[PDB]
Amino acid sequence: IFSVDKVRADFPVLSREVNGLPLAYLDSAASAQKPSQVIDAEAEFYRHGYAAVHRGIHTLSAQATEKMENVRKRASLFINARSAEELVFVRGTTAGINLVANSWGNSNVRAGDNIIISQMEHHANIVPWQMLCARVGAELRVIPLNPDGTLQLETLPTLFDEKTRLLAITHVSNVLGTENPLAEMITLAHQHGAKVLVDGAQAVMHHPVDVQALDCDFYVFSGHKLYGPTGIGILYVKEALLQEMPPWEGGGSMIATVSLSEGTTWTKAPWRFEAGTPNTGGIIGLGAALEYVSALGLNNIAEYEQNLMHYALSQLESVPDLTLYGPQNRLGVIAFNLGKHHAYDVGSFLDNYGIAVRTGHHCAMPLMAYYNVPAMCRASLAMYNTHEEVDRLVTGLQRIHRLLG
Amino acid sequence: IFSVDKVRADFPVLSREVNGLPLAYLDSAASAQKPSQVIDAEAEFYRHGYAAVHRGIHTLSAQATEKMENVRKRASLFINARSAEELVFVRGTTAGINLVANSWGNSNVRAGDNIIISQMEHHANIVPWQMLCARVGAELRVIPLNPDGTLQLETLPTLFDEKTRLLAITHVSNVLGTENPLAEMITLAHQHGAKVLVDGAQAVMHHPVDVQALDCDFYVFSGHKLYGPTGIGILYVKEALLQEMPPWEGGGSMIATVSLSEGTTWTKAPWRFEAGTPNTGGIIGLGAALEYVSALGLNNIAEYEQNLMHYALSQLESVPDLTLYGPQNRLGVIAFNLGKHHAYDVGSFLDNYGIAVRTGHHCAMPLMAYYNVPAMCRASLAMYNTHEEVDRLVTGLQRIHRLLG
Ligand SMILES: *Cc1c(COP(=O)(O)O)cnc(C)c1O
Numbered sequence: 019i020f021s022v023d024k025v026r027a028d029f030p031v032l033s034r035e036v037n038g039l040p041l042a043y044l045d046s047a048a049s050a051q052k053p054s055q056v057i058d059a060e061a062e063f064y065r066h067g068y069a070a071v072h073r074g075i076h077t078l079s080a081q082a083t084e085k086m087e088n089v090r091k092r093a094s095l096f097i098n099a100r101s102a103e104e105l106v107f108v109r110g111t112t113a114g115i116n117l118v119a120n121s122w123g124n125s126n127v128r129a130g131d132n133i134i135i136s137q138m139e140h141h142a143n144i145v146p147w148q149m150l151c152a153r154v155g156a157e158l159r160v161i162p163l164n165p166d167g168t169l170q171l172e173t174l175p176t177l178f179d180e181k182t183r184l185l186a187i188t189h190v191s192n193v194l195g196t197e198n199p200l201a202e203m204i205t206l207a208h209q210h211g212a213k214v215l216v217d218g219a220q221a222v223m224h225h226p227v228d229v230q231a232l233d234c235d236f237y238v239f240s241g242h243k244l245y246g247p248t249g250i251g252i253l254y255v256k257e258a259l260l261q262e263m264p265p266w267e268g269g270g271s272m273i274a275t276v277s278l279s280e281g282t283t284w285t286k287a288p289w290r291f292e293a294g295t296p297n298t299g300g301i302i303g304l305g306a307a308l309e310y311v312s313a314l315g316l317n318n319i320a321e322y323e324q325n326l327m328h329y330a331l332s333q334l335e336s337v338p339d340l341t342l343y344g345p346q347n348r349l350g351v352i353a354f355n356l357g358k359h360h361a362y363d364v365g366s367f368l369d370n371y372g373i374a375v376r377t378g379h380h381c382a383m384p385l386m387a388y389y390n391v392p393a394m395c396r397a398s399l400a401m402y403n404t405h406e407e408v409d410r411l412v413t414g415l416q417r418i419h420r421l422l423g
Numbered sequence: 424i425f426s427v428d429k430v431r432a433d434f435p436v437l438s439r440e441v442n443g444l445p446l447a448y449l450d451s452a453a454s455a456q457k458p459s460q461v462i463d464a465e466a467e468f469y470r471h472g473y474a475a476v477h478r479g480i481h482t483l484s485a486q487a488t489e490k491m492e493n494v495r496k497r498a499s500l501f502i503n504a505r506s507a508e509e510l511v512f513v514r515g516t517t518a519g520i521n522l523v524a525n526s527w528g529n530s531n532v533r534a535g536d537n538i539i540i541s542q543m544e545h546h547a548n549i550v551p552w553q554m555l556c557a558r559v560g561a562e563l564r565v566i567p568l569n570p571d572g573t574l575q576l577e578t579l580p581t582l583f584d585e586k587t588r589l590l591a592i593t594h595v596s597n598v599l600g601t602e603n604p605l606a607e608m609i610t611l612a613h614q615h616g617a618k619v620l621v622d623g624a625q626a627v628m629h630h631p632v633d634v635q636a637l638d639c640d641f642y643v644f645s646g647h648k649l650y651g652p653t654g655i656g657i658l659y660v661k662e663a664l665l666q667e668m669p670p671w672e673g674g675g676s677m678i679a680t681v682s683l684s685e686g687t688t689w690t691k692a693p694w695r696f697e698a699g700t701p702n703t704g705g706i707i708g709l710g711a712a713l714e715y716v717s718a719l720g721l722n723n724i725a726e727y728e729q730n731l732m733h734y735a736l737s738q739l740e741s742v743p744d745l746t747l748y749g750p751q752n753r754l755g756v757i758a759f760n761l762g763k764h765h766a767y768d769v770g771s772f773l774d775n776y777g778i779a780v781r782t783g784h785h786c787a788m789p790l791m792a793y794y795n796v797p798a799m800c801r802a803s804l805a806m807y808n809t810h811e812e813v814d815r816l817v818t819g820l821q822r823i824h825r826l827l828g
């Protein structure tokens with residue numbers, strides 16, 4: 019069983035005061051706080067083992083290269099990929115999607131084809147496909163939403179045909195907390211020869227993820243939302259697909275050969291897609307974050323988080339004129355608006371109480387437009403958040419409603 | 424005046440032992456060790472101030488955004504850029520050059536134009552231009568080398584004409600240590616309406632750099648070679664140029680607006696070119712590295728490093744059958760080969776003595792081909808290296824020559 023008090027003791031930021039009051043950090047969906055196990059692992063690498071990593075001859079460089087490839091292996095086991103060589107180190111989810119859209123997209127999506135996304139996607143899983151479709155002369159199709167924040171699955175027969183090359187779909191909405199039925203949608207996409215990219219940036223911290231079970235063709239997520247450092251993410255690609263993908267960004271570490279007269283050759287994938295000096299510090303930190311999460315146990319995390327979410331939704335019933343967006347079974351995040359008050363004002367009062375929520379469009383303007391609002395508030399309920407923090411949120415919304423009503 | 428013993432005490436890795444012997448780290452040109460001022464600044468941000476940075480409403484996010492923009496300002500002052508908004512945070516020098524080659528290159532280099540590089544360039548400042556020229560139907564021209572490792576400047580009349588759109592040129596060679604005469608080459612390029620990108624990745628740690636004095640149009644360098652964290656670099660672009668450059672990689676943080684029916688608009692530059700969550704941890708560390716270097720004083724650093732280099736070149740005269748490559752007045756690095764022994768074997772013996780040098784082509788295969796060798800050894804002599812470490816290198820080469828000769 020899970021002990022939130024023991025977990026919280028690992029996170030030094032949670033002792034912080036904001037506005038003279040104890041911090042209630044309810045914005046882990048934008049970025050997660052990091053335990054000292056992760057902070058110190060990166061710091062210790064810099065203090066005692068630092069070097070460049072291009073299988074350099076000398077000992078520090080050789081050992082740093084081994085550490086980095088060990089993290090790649092650890093990450094592949096974390097998502098149950100079949101091979102470590104199916105994972106690419108990327109700057110984050112946004113860059114991973116741009117990499118797929120350029121390298122794979124440019125050579126596999128042609129004039130008259132279509133790509134399917136959903137109306138709940140983060141901008142990072144929309145704009146690369148808009149740009150690709152424009153470059154290539156293809157059509158971007160959109161799975162629409164139901165009022166409860168789930169996809170209108172009944173529209174899939176109208177969107178999938180023999181010209182559908184790709185479904186790009188979020189695992190878990192960063193706004194609504196909706197978990198989409200990936201395994202079944204992937205089966206349908208594969209019946210038409212379409213590949214599937216899964217945006218897993220809001221999934222990998224909430225429960226186990228198994229890309230062989232899912233059978234997805236691409237899977238992306240960001241380290242900094244997985245209690246890890248900034249500047250590092252993971253792109254999983256099926257080996258058979260990845261080994262055919264052409265280069266993207268160019269230079270050292272990714273070339274095999276450079277000639278001014280004979281041109282340039284490229285090295286094998288996954289390294290083909292990691293140009294320049296990698297973010298070795300962030301990779302060390304990410305490995306430590308995976309070890310930390312695996313030690314707690316993702317099923318223990320999920321159980322505690324589901325209990326906290328059930329408690330929050332129960333308690334929020336006592337807030338007058340509160341509008342919630344999304345399904346009853348949401349993961350991770352609660353999107354809401356208070357009466358007719360603008361989200362910006364609600365979040366400002368909450369911050370004044372020491373409570374950190376996010377306001378605005380959450381990088382999902384088409385989702386805001388579907389609900390006919392310009393913005394929402396969003397509270398994340400992560401594994402280090404508590405019932406008492408939920409009580410502070412509920413009381414704060416009650417006070418705000420009484421003060422501004 | 425500079426005190427190497429005080430400086431070295433700031434760098435915890437320099438106490439390391441390699442192979443049971445005290446480390447002599449002579450590979451700072453591949454990547455620099457970091458002082459605890461830099462390591463701890465990043466760690467403290469994670470421990471006490473961490474949050475997402477997209478001018479979030481709540482206090483931690485607002486303060487993190489301010490910290491990041493303060494580093495941008497500090498970096499602009501470090502290179503004497505006129506405005507902080509002329510600097511883009513990039514993954515490193517390689518990504519910065521790829522950004523210029525795609526965004527600026529694709530809309531300013533047309534069929535029948537030419538681009539000029541030199542024969543001493545790092546692959547990162549070659550391959551993006553090869554790819555651009557192929558995309559666009561332009562010609563890549565090359566300034567050749569002299570035997571002493573300087574550019575054949577007399578060839579410039581044959582390479583520059585009214586169709587030259589860009590000169591892409593290294594400030595300091597990562598192999599030879601040659602410092603190129605940028606100010607004069609930039610004047611000539613500008614007479615033809617050509618822009619100039621300067622690869623400054625081996626310059627910014629050795630002496631002051633002033634991009635207004637240089638009048639370069641683009642300037643790039645990497646944090647991890649400037650005693651800073653991995654995963655972060657700086658791209659400087661003249662404001663008038665940068666404000667016309669179209670987007671590159673797409674998603675949140677760089678869009679102004681996303682609509683599924685009306686398309687997408689982009690935000691203003693510099694932020695236009697920073698898609699996704701930035702590497703906030705690395706940006707904090709980079710700011711601390713700039714403060715640390717500025718506190719030591721770049722002119723004090725240059726004076727000490729020049730003295731160390733003069734001592735090394737003097738002492739290396741006592742190594743039999745040593746071949747040095749490059750000019751007498753080199754900065755930072757000494758490239759060499761020992762007799763007919765392969766560089767890999769020489770570097771392996773040096774590593775066995777605890778001495779870290781780099782071997783191989785150094786991401787400069789055309790430079791290796793010019794000298795008709797497959798590889799070289801390279802020792803870097805940075806601000807924390809000592810006369811005693813130079814003595815260990817000289818003795819080691821003597822022992823290797825005696826043992827394998
Ligand atoms: C280090 C180096 C690069 C590449 O920089 P990264 O940090 O690996 O992207 C480019 N040019 C020169 C001269 C270099 O020394």
Ligand SMILES: *Cc1c(COP(=O)(O)O)cnc(C)c1O
Binds near residue numbers: 110218
């Ligand atoms: C965080 C987020 C992204 C963007 O990830 P970055 O780390 O900012 O690149 C993409 N998709 C979803 C669902 C997200 O929550």
